[PDB]
Copies of this chain bind each other. A is one copy, B any other.
Amino acid sequence: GSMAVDPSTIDWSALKFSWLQTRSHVRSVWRNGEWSPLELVNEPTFNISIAASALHYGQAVFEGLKVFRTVDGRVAAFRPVENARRLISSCDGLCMESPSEQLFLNALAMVVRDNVDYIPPYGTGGSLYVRPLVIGTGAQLGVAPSSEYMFLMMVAPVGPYYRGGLKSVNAIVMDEFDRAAPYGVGSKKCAGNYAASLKAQSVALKKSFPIQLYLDAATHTFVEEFSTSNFFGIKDIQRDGAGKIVSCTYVTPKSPSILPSITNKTLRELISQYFGWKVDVREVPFTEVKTFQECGATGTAVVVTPIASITRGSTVIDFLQSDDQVGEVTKLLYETVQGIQYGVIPDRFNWNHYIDV
């Protein structure tokens, strides 16, 4: 019976990326062919069958997107239609029912309006993290798709991921670990993929690597992605007489096993249609990694994680000399995404879904 955090007392500057109990979440339940009307729920728990399919047989997928208080005082969700469609794709891959795009967008507006006082104010660099979830809740023993599903959407304010500037990190390649089967569910944002990566995480954390890069499980010769973020590389950077970048190539792996990052898609669209440079979505052999001039990971919580080095066995590929250093194009991407998200750069590609609050 725990109480909501008082929004008027939240020190936004101390926020990191943690669970925080806001006023409400929204809920809908599927049975007999239809979702029930969306409802606000104040208590951050629900009653689940001890036999729920989500707990025994893994029918559980989720999403992640951000809502922002913009420079002119409005509220916008960043590309939520992309999340609604990926949620449907994750559900389908696990034989789960899913809310339609419109039900998803209705849930978002409903939950954002009821928790509007939890959106970190403009100037904090914070945001409202949105976590949609679909889980099989029917009680069953045989291994089969559940007959009942629940769609939840919860929110929590998070602080600026980079309080005080972009920082680069060291990555390790997991040679004795896979994150996805070649013909598996690596492209679905499903619960099981994350627990299946925890053992590799602890091995990498014990060696002081905050991020783990995976190669393709089939041959272990091509870059796949990090455990919770896509991989990209930058090369062929060319500049004019003023030092301005006038050309470069953004490279990112292509594979049915890779989670299709919406931030990655955003970066590709910025590289080619906003800045007018080259984008390559193709197989990235690991031997090519040493030819990249910049390397990064991409995902909603970080936008980008600049990669200072990649370690595989005893071979080290060094991109940046210090964690203070970050790739120039990588930083440009970060600032351009954030400029659009917060309303400072005009939203040329209509990525911002404004919510009337």
Contacts and interface: CB of A to CB of B under 8 A. Distances in A.
Given A143-B227, A182-B178, A191 B194 contact: no
A58 B60 contact: yes
A159 to B, nearest CB: 12
Interface of A: 17-19, 25, 44-51, 54-60, 62, 93-96, 129, 131, 133, 135-136, 139-145, 152, 154, 156, 158, 176-185, 190-199, 201-202, 217-218, 227-228
A139 B133 CA distance: 14
Contacts of A47: 45-48
From A17, A62, A139, name the one whose CB has the most chain B CB atoms within 10 angstroms.
Answer: A139
A19 B184 contact: no
Given A57-B195, A60-B191, A192-B195, 5 more contacts: A19-B140, A55-B55, A179-B181, A182-B217, A185-B192
A199 to B, nearest CB: 6
From A57, A62, A140, A190, name the one whose CB has the most chain B CB atoms within 10 angstroms.
Answer: A57
A331 B45 CA distance: 49
A2 to B, nearest CB: 9
A156 B140 CA distance: 11
A61 to B, nearest CB: 9
Given A45-B49, A178-B183, A178-B184, A199 B58 contact: no
Given A18-B141, A46-B47, A227-B143, A54 B199 contact: no
A161 to B, nearest CB: 11
B139 A198 contact: no
From A45, A95, A191, name the one whose CB has the most chain B CB atoms within 10 angstroms.
Answer: A191
